[PDB]
Amino acid sequence: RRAAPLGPMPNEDIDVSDLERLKKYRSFDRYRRRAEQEARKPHWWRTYREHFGEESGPKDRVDIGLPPPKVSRTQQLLERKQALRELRANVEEERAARLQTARIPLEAVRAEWERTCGPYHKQRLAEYCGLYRDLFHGATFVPRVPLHVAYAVGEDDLMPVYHGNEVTPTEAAQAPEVTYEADEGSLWTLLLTNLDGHLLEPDAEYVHWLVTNIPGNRVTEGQETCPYLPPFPARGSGFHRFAFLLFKQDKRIDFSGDTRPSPCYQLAQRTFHTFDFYKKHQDAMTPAGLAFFQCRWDDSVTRVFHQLLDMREPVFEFVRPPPYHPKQKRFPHRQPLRYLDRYRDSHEPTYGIY
Amino acid sequence: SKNLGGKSPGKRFGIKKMEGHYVHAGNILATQRHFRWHPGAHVGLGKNKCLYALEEGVVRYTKEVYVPNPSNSEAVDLVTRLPQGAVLYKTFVHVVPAKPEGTFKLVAML
């Protein structure tokens, strides 16, 4: 019995007859490129992604953020071509490229990167780390404005907080310094949220530093709704994510429900839901800055748990599922002598009546 | 008379677990004389071309592109001899893991 294909066959387009006049690729790299391009297409048969989680394939993501900057593409391409021609007109650059001795201004490269295409890379990195999935669950934004957060470890020691870095709680004990370019006519809100670390609810997150109504760039002038709290991740469950979200707002938002007390050491009061927060403040707030980092347990989390939170330090462990063993047979045929040890409760001799 | 030695039992070369079967680690998925089913995710390859599960999960069978090892000279030669639009496809067997790697249990609240 034969069945008809439910769509087009893979190699049905090229002509089988007269193969010599047909061009071939003599490069394993060419074939690998062609194969990796063909493997990403939505075939009608059972594929690997369909079973191993393409995440519902294509999804219409809601964009909640600032519009992209309207630039003149023609003038941009013109000035870029002019700069490239000026760079190629030199001779010392050609000598350096020929002699394989040429350096790169990594600082200027990073600056131009965060100026032109850094936002999209940060957006995709946050999508990979699962920030949007746990902050809005249906919407991903683009960090249009940059956000430079840095912790002070001493007098000349400044540790930055990039998109996905690892910062020790000892370095993150004090409140960090934030920077971002903004005119003196806008208002901003900064929110440090801990996605993992809530002991009671899995679907909730913790607050660490919430300060709204920021005039321009002066973050210290704005009223802090939630005082700064150092990261306190458990000893067993490590590598929690802490995200600084910066929202730009239009009106002078005033709220008495989201306000925290000055001590603010109650974990029941420090329970956040960024989805409901943005649902409440969706009219004015719009997220424009984002900076998330990883954090594990260190010797200061015990101090934070005992002195500040007035708790006992909870210690977890990564346990594994028990090993699978079949149903024990009465007469295990041709099994080794150690078959009887796989079903032993304890390695202790038990004398029933003796 | 003249024809001798034609008597030999079948080696039972076949597919043991079908698609959808919940298997465990070490379960032989399929045995073969030549490469009919190729291993994919969480499916090992014995020296007798047999396929066994490396994780505990559900067996799946897919049709996927074939990029051979750049050292296997015959396969690389066939690849470079293929036309410009040809792409080799093979039947791969995968094991979709069901049980998680582990959980975080509270052992002591000191």
């Binding site: 019995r1 034969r2 069945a3 008809a4 294909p5 439910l6 066959m9 893979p10 190699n11 090229i14 089988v16 193969l19 048969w45 | 049709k63 074939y66 066939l78 001899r81 293929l82 036309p83 040809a86 080799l88 496809y89 093979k90 039947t91």
Partner: peptide, 21 residues
């Protein structure tokens, strides 16, 4: 399989031949 719609998806010997007046 023969009766499946994906029969002959690995068919490749027709794309290469490796066996004048």
């Amino acid at each position: 399989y023969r009766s499946k719609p994906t029969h002959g998806i690995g068919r490749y010997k027709h794309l290469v031949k490796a066996q004048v007046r």
